Amino acid sequence: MIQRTPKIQVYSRHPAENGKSNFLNCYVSGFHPSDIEVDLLKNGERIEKVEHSDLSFSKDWSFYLLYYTEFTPTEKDEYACRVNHVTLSQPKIVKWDRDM
């Protein structure tokens, strides 16, 4: 058996075909087992509709999850990714850097 802690990246992108749109992305990578809980938070509160969740694996040992949704951020609001996994003794909260 193997277990691997997820790596978590939080970042924003504008789709080229719709440059005014802005997406907040969670990239949760390299984890095992696949059982996982992932939320986007806005001001400590969970975001309800998250347009997309794309799950894949490399070889059998490793999963990859892209979690993302459109958003309109102000300089006041705060966004984060919360991840819970059996490898983590406490839920991992990764804040969005407004420069990324």
Numbering used by the authors: 0 to 99
Describing publication, verbatim:
To better compare these data with crystallographic data, the crystal structures of wt and D76N were determined from diffraction data collected at room temperature (RT) rather than at 100 K. The RT structures are highly comparable in terms of conformation and B factors with structures from frozen crystals. For the wt, the residues showing the highest dispersion are located in the BC-loop, comprising Pro32, as well as residues located in the nearby N-terminus of the protein. Our results show the presence of distinct minor conformers exchanging with a major form, on sub-millisecond timescales, within the crystal lattice of both wt and D76N. In keeping with these observations, ensembles resulting from RAM simulations showed that β2m displays two distinct conformational states in both mutant and wt.
A recent case of systemic amyloidosis involves the highly unstable D76N mutation of beta-2 microglobulin (β2m). Indeed, the 76 position is located in a solvent exposed loop between β-strands E and F. A detailed analysis of the interaction energies of the ensembles reveals that D76 is at the center of a network of stabilizing electrostatic interactions that are lost in the D76N mutant.
